[PDB]
From Swiss-Prot, chain A:
Annotated cofactor note: Binds 1 [2Fe-2S] cluster.
Family: Belongs to the 2Fe2S plant-type ferredoxin family.
GO biological process: electron transport chain
Molecular-function GO term, any one: 2 iron, 2 sulfur cluster binding
Assembly notes: Forms a complex with heterodimeric ferredoxin-thioredoxin reductase (FTR) and thioredoxin.
Function comment: Ferredoxins are iron-sulfur proteins that transfer electrons in a wide variety of metabolic reactions.
Required co-factors: [2Fe-2S] cluster
Protein name (database record): Ferredoxin-1, chloroplastic
UniProtKB/Swiss-Prot annotation, chain D:
Membrane topology: Single-pass membrane protein
Described function: May help in the organization of the PsaL subunit.
Keywords, alphabetical: Chloroplast, Membrane, Photosynthesis, Photosystem I, Plastid, Thylakoid, Transmembrane, Transmembrane helix
Protein name (record): Photosystem I reaction center subunit VIII
Entry similarity comment: Belongs to the PsaI family.
GO terms under biological process: photosynthesis
Transmembrane residue ranges: 7-27
Part of the full-length chain shown: 2 to 32 of 40
S-S pairs: none
Subcellular location field: Plastid, Chloroplast thylakoid membrane
Chief localization: plastid
Assigned GO CC terms: chloroplast thylakoid membrane; photosystem I
Curated annotation (Swiss-Prot), chain F:
Subcellular location as annotated: Plastid, Chloroplast thylakoid membrane
Single annotated GO MF: oxidoreductase activity
Function: Apoprotein for the two 4Fe-4S centers FA and FB of photosystem I (PSI); essential for photochemical activity. FB is the terminal electron acceptor of PSI, donating electrons to ferredoxin. The C-terminus interacts with PsaA/B/D and helps assemble the protein into the PSI complex. Required for binding of PsaD and PsaE to PSI. PSI is a plastocyanin-ferredoxin oxidoreductase, converting photonic excitation into a charge separation, which transfers an electron from the donor P700 chlorophyll pair to the spectroscopically characterized acceptors A0, A1, FX, FA and FB in turn.
Cofactor mode of binding and number, as noted: Binds 2 [4Fe-4S] clusters. Cluster 2 is most probably the spectroscopically characterized electron acceptor FA and cluster 1 is most probably FB.
Binding site for [4Fe-4S] cluster 1: C10, C13, C16, C57
Name of the protein in its database record: Photosystem I iron-sulfur center
CC annotations in GO: chloroplast thylakoid membrane; photosystem I
Cofactor: [4Fe-4S] cluster
Length: 97, 88, 157, 31, 143, 80, 42, 743
């Protein structure tokens, strides 16, 4: 259900609660910890990030490498947090390489 | 290294691979003859207008005065004609 | 050892070297032909051209045309080859007319196979192309005439 | 003296000849 | 403001065997392109025209016939290898032209010394009808 | 040379610049979006007109547009 | 077994069964009342 | 190093949960549908194994079990054939009088008047005359009762269940690992010596003990029920020694090396059996013996586990010279890591083999009473030509797939491939030229001929009467094949076929089995047409393969895949640059070439081969012999072949051949229906679907899986599929109706 989320960020690391049927981005939108986005549609790399633990539902994710979902990177705006997760933010370019 | 800003043609390959640049092998008595007699046909407009009108001349001529052994279209029919399905 | 090499050691020009394009026999032969006799008067080369090609174009029009068996008209079908010579020399003339202008240098390459400068081949002029045209045409019609002159029985008339 | 004997050839052979050389020289001309 | 590098000829070229896909007459009379890169070691890579070549350790200098060839080769070099490349346009005059990257940075990263070319400040649904521009040589998207 | 135009609905995702095969496009600074970014098209004399950029744009409707126009040697993609 | 009940309701199987039954029904009707051009009843 | 069995236990678990979740194999399909496009993709990528995953082991496991599934299906189809021969056929009566009863193994129920399709095929039976030639096989096998057909149907059903179980087993319980598959030396040793050697040895055995004696009895005139059962011939041997004295010494010669004493039933005769119009069975048994010996020896070439043998890598590395650099070094690494390279080579060879089978089976008829059954001969030649062409085109498809997805000079470099890639321009230039020249000098002759025949100038034609173009080499070769038996083949009596010549003609039941086929100007023209069509098909397919990765027009084509619509309308327009589109275009040209091949064979056989012979010995051919003089113009093909022979099919309404009349028209319809998909594009269709969707929305009846128009590539594929089906089915109906009607 509404597992706790953990996001490392240059601002720090903060937690907010939010049901599994949601995308991470609107839920960091709720409590008010600002994150970088451009598209909100899963077709760019501004909302990119990687994981510390658990793993996130990436069913409705697209425009990604047939690997970007098997070695860590995730787009925060099309992602369902199946577990109590611990994630990274501002991770576009070390993804952009 | 095959890039030299000074000489561009060698870098982009403007060689003549089969040209010779050797002297003439047609000794002058033979060349003499030809470049004397074959000169008047060496102007562009001259040659073109002459060729066109002379070819047309020969064609109209040989077309208007060709004999029957040549062209069945000239020998005409040699038979009585049939009647059509009703008419004729 | 290998036989095919890039053209003059440059492996980024769009071609190769083989025993077909760069071979001593082929090189010497292709060099001694009229089109590749750069340092010769255009008209002489054209003369060789027209001679050979009128003589060659005699045969087929004679031995295959509509009157091949009618010989009150079989041999005199050299009229056809004369007409073909006329037509493709008209084509030569319009090609030269459109491709060149006298007040411009000749587009031929100035470098040779080893990297020395050459005086650009003058056949690629406007002037010299008209000269070569006249030569080819003169040769073509009189070569038609020559191979019609040899009507004497040989092996296959 | 046969009238088609002259008109059919030149409209069929030389008219297109002169017109094709004409239009070629015109269409490949940079003014 | 980012002087661009110079073209250093005598820069060696990769080890190629020759192919029928290289330069043609257009490079003699109109233009051609030149790419240069670094290559920490000698390695094999797929030519953007034919088979495979060996890039030499140290600077590398290739001559191609289209900007798209240079850019496809550069994309391959930049992602699969970690290599920096630049390419240039050479005219039959003997004149070079540094081409890419233009201002020193790659265009997918925003640099503060760039002006806007071809930007309309409205949505695409707010172009006039063609009847508004008839008989005058502009186009509805020109505005 | 074709025409390429950028419209103010752009969200500055850069996906169009990454896709161009001839390096026509560029990102420039802006103030009208969260990314403070906008696309520009400074080098349209090299555009082959593939519309690879339009397939990449996510806005509805498009924010980059390619209008095919007069053809040249570079525009046709001729190597000879 | 439940998964089988679901699978049997996927589109191609459902349509296959529906039309095979319909075909049997029309075939038997025409085997009983052959060569009908009109409604001969009322 | 050494060779062994290597297997994993229980890799995947048998379950139904994945049946209820459509598109489990691909992550994109698994997510589920938003639009109808999903439903299409689900089927298009179903067997693209190496795209569902990256692991070679998984792809090979899937391929192995898929092969087992295919074999199970084939066994079920064979089971059906034998059961229908046993249960709904007139095979016994045909066995009694083969040259009057026309074979039939399918009857129809009387439902809507369709029982008219149960026609009088002779023998007190009414059904559909079959053309697969199964009765001829069953007679050449020795089968004489329907109980044997029942038995083989049951055995085939058992074998099909066995194949299906093995397919499940090797995927879910005992799945072999990659090193097992990648052992090609032991595989070749087994297929050469075990599958093909032991197979033809066992079959030669069956022919020596069953087919030969039962056919001897049948040709002697004995009633097919009073012939002993085959096993009697094995229990009591005096039965065999009565027909072949050599069976008294019984394997003493085979050891005493006096093989001469077997000349009884192992012969080298050549020619046909003048009683049944087929090859001598005593020749076929001896042939199979020899082939088995050859294969059993050839299956001992490659080293597996005992030193002796040949290393394939060593053979390939040994071959190289001054024109090819290092060639063949690096092909063993390639041919063992890509399934697509293997599939391309295999498809090429199997297609060529099928075409060769077509030719050899018409020219030297193997089965008894097949040569005079004209419908079966036409059917078999045509069927096998079509199969061969299709397989050859698939070969190109998978060579292109290898070039796009697998070729990699960074980790697997081969020299020959690299050099061909480095002069592809000259290659395609010369092939283009030769196809243009070949097209001018073959079809151009036909156009010259039509124009000379319409201009009242037949003395200016290209024909046997005016301007002769005799194929001197073909005539010279068949003359050498005529004089062969006795001069360059002293051990032969008659020559290999009756088409070579020698003045020998074979007849059966008052019909012509075979006679010498005459070559003339028309044969010369037709063969050069054939060379033209094959060269064009090759040009298209090889251009598709060689430029699958990059071009001067699109320099990074490999990054767009193997099957993509285009790269946009720029650069002038780049529709159909992909290699898939080259395969799509090559299918039309294969259709063209094979169609002309089967038309040439069909007209030539009726005109100069088939017919009826009289007791006085005057042969009347089906068509009058008009191929020599009417085949040389196009008008003669339209008039004397199409218009004159379509009469049988356009007059079948009311007879038992009326199904062919219905299929003629249906096939024309399907062909014309494909042009709609081939001539249009999907933008128009999506915009029309917009308005239809509006109308549905107006009534709260609009679907949730949003309807889309088909893909660009799907449009092309639907188009070519319906085009091929329509055309081939039209020719199918025409041929079968025509050949069945006259005879
Ligand atoms: C539409 C007008 C037209 C006309 C009037 C002709 C007329 C003729 N054609 Mg022709 N043809 C045409 C169109 C035409 N064709 C087209 C469009 C095609 C393409 C399909 C052909 C293809 C064709 C072929 C393949 C052949 C002919 C041949 C012939 C000649 C056959 C009769 C003959 O034996 O003459 C008498 C025999 C002669 C040799 C007369 C030669 C004509 C003079 C002497 C040539 C002088 C030319 C002159 C210097 C300049 C050339 C033209 C100039 C006025 C611009 C005849 C003069 C046949 C032929 O004879 O070949 C030559 C033949 O082989 N035609
Ligand atoms: C558009 C009307 C027309 C058409 C379709 C034809 C068609 C034909 N004419 Mg005819 N002709 C016409 C008008 C026409 N003519 C007129 C008004 C005259 C003068 C009264 C003639 C005098 C004429 C003669 C003497 C002969 C023909 C002949 C022929 C036939 C041979 C082809 C040929 O040589 O061309 C026609 C050749 C000509 C010299 C016609 C010249 C006069 C017309 C007006 C030329 C028009 C050209 C014009 C600039 C282009 C108009 C544009 C458009 C037609 C494309 C051909 C079927 C020949 C024949 O009978 O073949 C057996 C023949 O020798 N024509
Ligand atoms: C729009 C096209 C069309 C139409 C209007 C018809 C109409 C008809 N067809 Mg036909 N048919 C067609 C296309 C068409 N067909 C095509 C394309 C084919 C080729 C595949 C055929 C092949 C075909 C055959 C072989 C036969 C027919 C027959 C018939 C008649 C059947 C009457 C019947 O079924 O009894 C009554 C059926 C019912 C009353 C069913 C309704 C009862 C429901 C289920 C119960 C509801 C209770 C509340 C009927 C007049 C039959 C016939 O008798 O011809 C004279 C027949 O033999 N058709
Ligand atoms: C590729 C193989 C093949 C093909 C194309 C056919 C084709 C045909 N068979 Mg046949 N058959 C086959 C294999 C095949 N069979 C095998 C392997 C056997 C057992 C050895 C049989 C035994 C058989 C019998 C006994 C009969 C046929 C009949 C028929 C004809 C009517 C079709 C029918 O079944 O009625 C209607 C179709 C149905 C009722 C639906 C079939 C559903 C059944 C239950 C099995 C399919 C279930 C599936 C596994 C799920 C038809 C032309 C019938 C016939 O000839 O009539 C005169 C007939 O009675 N077949
Ligand atoms: C004498 C040994 C032998 C024989 C007879 C065969 C025979 C066959 N192999 Mg095989 N193979 C062998 C050894 C052998 N193999 C070895 C040693 C290896 C590598 C270790 C392989 C690896 C291999 C692969 C990868 C594939 C084959 C395939 C095939 C089939 C090819 C298609 C065909 O022609 O079908 C002809 C059909 C018949 C002849 C019908 C009769 C079928 C009989 C019963 C086959 C039984 C032979 C088999 C070896 C029995 C062992 C099983 C046993 C433990 C119970 C064929 C039946 C293909 C396949 O598996 O298709 C499923 C294929 O993909 N083989
Ligand atoms: C794998 C094929 C095959 C098989 C299974 C058999 C099986 C058999 N053959 Mg044989 N045979 C074969 C091929 C085969 N043959 C071939 C190719 C030839 C030609 C050289 C012969 C020629 C031959 C002779 C001459 C004899 C047999 C005989 C026999 C039977 C003797 C029983 C025995 O000792 O074993 C036996 C059932 C003997 C026999 O007829 O027993 C009834 C007998 O004398 N065979
Ligand atoms: C041993 C033979 C063989 C094998 C194992 C394969 C295997 C494969 N092929 Mg291939 N191919 C072959 C032969 C073979 N092919 C031949 C002979 C050709 C020439 C036509 C091709 C041309 C070809 C192309 C162009 C492509 C493949 C592709 C593929 C891959 C995916 C196929 C797929 O699942 O699509 C799904 C299968 C279907 C959707 C079924 C299609 C149904 C057809 C169109 C209907 C046929 C009508 C039917 C015969 C009669 C009408 C019945 C009706 C009236 C009811 C796969 C690995 C694809 C690929 O991407 O490779 C990676 C690819 O695009 N093949
Ligand atoms: C070049 C054309 C040619 C061809 C295709 C053949 C073909 C054949 N010859 Mg032959 N032969 C030829 C020329 C030819 N011959 C000539 C010019 C002469 C001298 C006049 C002979 C003399 C000759 C004799 C005496 C015999 C044959 C036999 C045979 C048959 C068995 C082949 C064989 O022994 O396996 C090949 C044997 C090998 C050891 C493999 C060697 C591979 C070759 C040499 C390469 C075979 C069909 C035999 C026969 O009659 O069969 C019944 C036989 O008795 N030939
Ligand atoms: C055909 C019979 C199908 C029976 C079936 O689907 O359910 C029967 C079960 C599905 O039933 C499942 O069974 C599992 C353990 O067997 C678990 O207990 C699940 O809870 C149970 O739902 O599937 C099978 O066992 C059939 C395997 C293949 C048979 C062919
Ligand atoms: C076969 C005929 C071709 C002769 C190849 C002669 C031959 O085998 O050459 C041999 C040569 C390579 O031989 P090597 O000495 O390198 O051999 C060492 C390695 O091959 C070891 O396997 O190949 C070439 O020369 C390049 C191929 C270009 C060939 C151009 C010919 C193009 C078409 C010719 C076909 C026209 C007739 C076909 C009618 C069927
Ligand atoms: S969308 Fe269609 S018409 Fe346009 S370029 Fe692609 S294939 Fe051609
Ligand atoms: S905004 Fe770019 S992925 Fe969410």
């Amino acid at each position: 259900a509404s597992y706790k989320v953990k996001l490392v960020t240059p601002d720090g690391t903060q937690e907010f609660e939010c049901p599994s049927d949601v995308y991470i981005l609107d839920h960091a939108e709720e409590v008010g910890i600002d994150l970088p986005y451009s598209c909100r549609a899963g077709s760019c790399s501004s909302c990119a990030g990687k994981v510390v633990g658990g793993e996130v539902d990436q069913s409705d994710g697209s425009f990604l490498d047939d690997e970007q979902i098997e070695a860590g990177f995730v787009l925060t705006c099309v992602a369902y947090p199946t577990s109590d997760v611990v994630i990274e933010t501002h991770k576009e370019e070390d993804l952009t390489a | 290294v095959y890039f030299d800003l000074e000489d561009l043609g060698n870098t982009t390959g403007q060689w003549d691979l089969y040209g010779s640049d050797a002297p003439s092998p047609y000794n002058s008595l033979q060349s003499k003859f030809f470049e004397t007699f074959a000169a008047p046909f060496t102007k562009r407009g001259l040659l073109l207008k002459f060729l066109i009108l002379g070819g047309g001349s020969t064609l109209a001529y040989f077309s208007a005065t060709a004999s029957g052994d040549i062209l069945p279209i000239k020998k005409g029919p040699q038979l009585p004609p049939q009647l059509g399905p009703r008419l004729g | 050892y290998q036989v095919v090499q890039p053209i003059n050691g440059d492996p980024f020009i769009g071609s190769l070297e083989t025993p077909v394009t760069s071979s001593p026999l082929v090189a010497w032969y292709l060099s001694n032909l009229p089109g590749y006799r750069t340092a010769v008067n255009p008209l002489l080369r054209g003369i060789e051209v027209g001679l050979a090609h009128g003589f060659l174009l005699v045969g087929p029009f004679v031995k295959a045309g509509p009157l091949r068996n009618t010989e009150i008209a079989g041999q005199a079908g050299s009229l056809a080859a004369g007409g073909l010579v006329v037509i493709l020399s008209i084509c030569l003339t319009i090609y030269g007319i459109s491709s060149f202008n006298e007040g411009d240098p000749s587009t031929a390459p100035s470098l040779t196979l080893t990297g020395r400068k050459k005086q650009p081949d003058q056949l690629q002029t406007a002037d010299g192309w008209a000269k070569f045209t006249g030569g080819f045409f003169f040769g073509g019609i009189s070569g038609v005439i020559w191979a019609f002159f040899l009507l004497y029985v040989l092996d296959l008339p | 003296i046969n009238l088609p004997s002259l008109f059919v050839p030149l409209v069929g052979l030389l008219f297109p000849a002169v017109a094709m050389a004409s239009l070629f020289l015109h269409v490949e001309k940079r003014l | 403001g980012f002087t661009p590098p110079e073209l250093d000829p005598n820069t060696p070229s990769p080890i190629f065997g020759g192919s029928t896909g290289g330069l043609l007459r257009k490079a003699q009379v109109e233009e051609f392109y030149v790419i240069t890169w670094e290559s920490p070691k000698e390695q094999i890579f797929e030519m953007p025209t034919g088979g495979a070549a060996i890039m030499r350790e140290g600077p590398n200098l290739l001559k191609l016939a289209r900007k798209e060839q240079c850019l496809a080769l550069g994309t391959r070099l930049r992602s699969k290898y970690k290599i920096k490349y630049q390419f240039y346009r050479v005219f039959p005059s003997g004149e070079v032209q540094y081409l890419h990257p233009k201002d020193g940075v790659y265009p997918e990263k925003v640099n503060p010394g760039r002006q806007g070319v071809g930007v309309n400040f409205r949505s695409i649904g707010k172009n006039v009808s063609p009847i508004e521009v008839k008989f005058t040589g502009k186009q509805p998207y020109d505005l | 040379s074709h025409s390429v135009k950028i419209y103010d609905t752009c969200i500055g995702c850069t996906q169009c610049v990454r896709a161009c095969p001839t390096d026509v496009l560029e990102m420039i600074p802006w103030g009208g979006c969260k990314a403070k970014q906008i696309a520009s098209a400074p080098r349209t004399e090299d555009c082959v007109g593939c519309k690879r950029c339009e397939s990449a744009c996510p806005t509805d409707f498009l924010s980059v547009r390619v209008y095919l126009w007069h053809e040249t040697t570079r525009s046709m993609g001729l190597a000879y | 077994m439940r998964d089988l009940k679901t699978y049997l309701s996927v589109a191609p199987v459902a349509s296959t069964l529906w039309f095979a039954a319909l075909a049997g029904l029309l075939i038997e009707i025409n085997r009983f009342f052959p060569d009908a051009l009109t409604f001969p009843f009322f | 190093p050494e060779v062994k069995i290597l297997v994993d236990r229980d890799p995947i678990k048998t379950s139904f949960e994945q049946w209820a979740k459509p598109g489990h194999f691909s992550r994109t399909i698994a997510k589920g549908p938003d639009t109808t496009t999903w439903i299409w993709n689900l089927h298009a990528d179903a067997h693209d194994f190496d795209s569902h995953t990256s692991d070679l082991e998984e792809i090979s496991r899937k391929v192995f079990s898929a092969h087992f599934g295919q074999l199970s299906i084939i066994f079920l189809w064979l089971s059906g054939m034998y059961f229908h021969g046993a249960r709904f056929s007139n095979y016994e009566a045909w066995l009694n009088d083969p040259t009057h009863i026309r074979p039939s193994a399918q009857v129809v129920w009387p439902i809507v008047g369709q029982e008219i399709l149960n026609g009088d095929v002779g023998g007190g039976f009414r059904g559909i005359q079959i053309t697969s030639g199964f009765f001829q096989i069953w007679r050449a096998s020795g089968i004489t009762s329907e109980l044997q057909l029942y038995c083989t149907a049951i055995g085939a059903l058992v074998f099909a269940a066995l194949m299906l179980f093995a397919g499940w087993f090797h995927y879910h319980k005992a799945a072999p690992k990659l090193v097992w598959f990648q052992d090609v030396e032991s595989m070749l040793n087994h297929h050469l010596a075990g599958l093909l050697g032991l197979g033809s040895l066992s079959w030669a055995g069956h022919q020596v003990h069953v087919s030969l004696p039962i056919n001897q009895f049948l040709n002697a005139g004995v009633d097919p029920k009073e012939i002993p059962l085959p096993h009697e011939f094995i229990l009591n041997r005096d039965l065999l020694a009565q027909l072949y004295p050599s069976f008294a010494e019984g394997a003493t010669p085979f050891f005493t090396l006096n093989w001469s004493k077997y000349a009884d039933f192992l012969t080298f005769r050549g020619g046909l059996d003048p009683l049944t119009g087929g090859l001598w069975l005593t020749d076929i048994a001896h042939h199979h013996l020899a082939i088995a010996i050859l294969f059993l020896i050839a299956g001992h070439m490659y080293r597996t586990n005992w030193g002796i043998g040949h290393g394939i890598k060593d053979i390939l590395e040994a071959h190289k010279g001054p024109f090819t650099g290092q060639g063949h070094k690096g092909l063993y690494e390639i041919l063992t890591t890509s399934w697509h390279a293997q599939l391309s080579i295999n498809l090429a060879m199997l297609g060529s083999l099928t075409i060769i089978v077509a030719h050899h089976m018409y020219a030297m008829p193997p089965y008894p009473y097949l040569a005079t059954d004209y419908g079966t001969q036409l059917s078999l030649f045509t069927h096998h030509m079509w199969i061969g062409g299709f397989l050859i085109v698939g070969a190109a498809a998978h060579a292109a797939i290898f070039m796009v997805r697998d070729y990699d000079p960074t980790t697997r470099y081969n020299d020959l491939l690299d050099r061909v890639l480095r002069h592809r321009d000259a290659i395609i230039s010369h092939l283009n030229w030769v196809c243009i020249f070949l097209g001018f000098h073959s079809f151009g002759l036909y156009i010259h001929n039509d124009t000379m025949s319409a201009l009242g100038r037949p003395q200016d034609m290209f024909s046997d009467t005016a301007i002769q173009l005799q194929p001197v080499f073909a005539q010279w070769i068949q003359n050498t094949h005529a004089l062969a038996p006795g001069t360059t083949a002293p051990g032969a009596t008659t020559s290999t076929s009756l088409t070579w010549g020698g003045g020998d003609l074979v007849s059966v039941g008052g019909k012509v089995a075979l006679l010498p086929i005459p070559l003339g100007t028309a044969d010369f023209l037709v063969h050069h047409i054939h060379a033209f069509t094959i060269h064009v098909t090759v040009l298209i397919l090889l251009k598709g393969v060689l430029f699958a990765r990059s071009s001067r027009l699109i320099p990074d084509k490999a990054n767009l895949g193997f099957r993509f619509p285009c790269d946009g309308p720029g650069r002038g327009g780049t529709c159909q640059v992909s290699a898939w589109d080259h395969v799509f275009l090559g299918l039309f040209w294969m259709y063209n070439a094979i169609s002309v091949v089967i038309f040439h064979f069909s007209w030539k056989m009726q005109s100069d081969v088939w017919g009826s012979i009289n007791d006085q010995g005057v042969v009347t051919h089906i068509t009058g012999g008009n191929f020599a003089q009417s085949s040389i113009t196009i008008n003669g093909w339209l008039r004397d072949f199409l218009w004159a022979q379509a009469s049988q099919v356009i007059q079948s309404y009311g007879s038992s051949l009326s199904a062919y009349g219905l299929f003629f028209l249906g096939a024309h319809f399907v062909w014309a229906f494909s042009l709609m998909f081939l001539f249009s594009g999907r933008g128009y269709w999506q915009e029309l679907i917009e308005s239809i969707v509006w109308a549905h929305n107006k009534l709260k009846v609009a679907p949730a899986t949003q309807p889309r128009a088909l893909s660009i590539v799907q449009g092309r594929a639907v188009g070519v599929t319906h085009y091929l089906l329509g055309g081939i089915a039209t020719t199918w109906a025409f041929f079968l109706a025509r050949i069945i009607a006259v005879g």
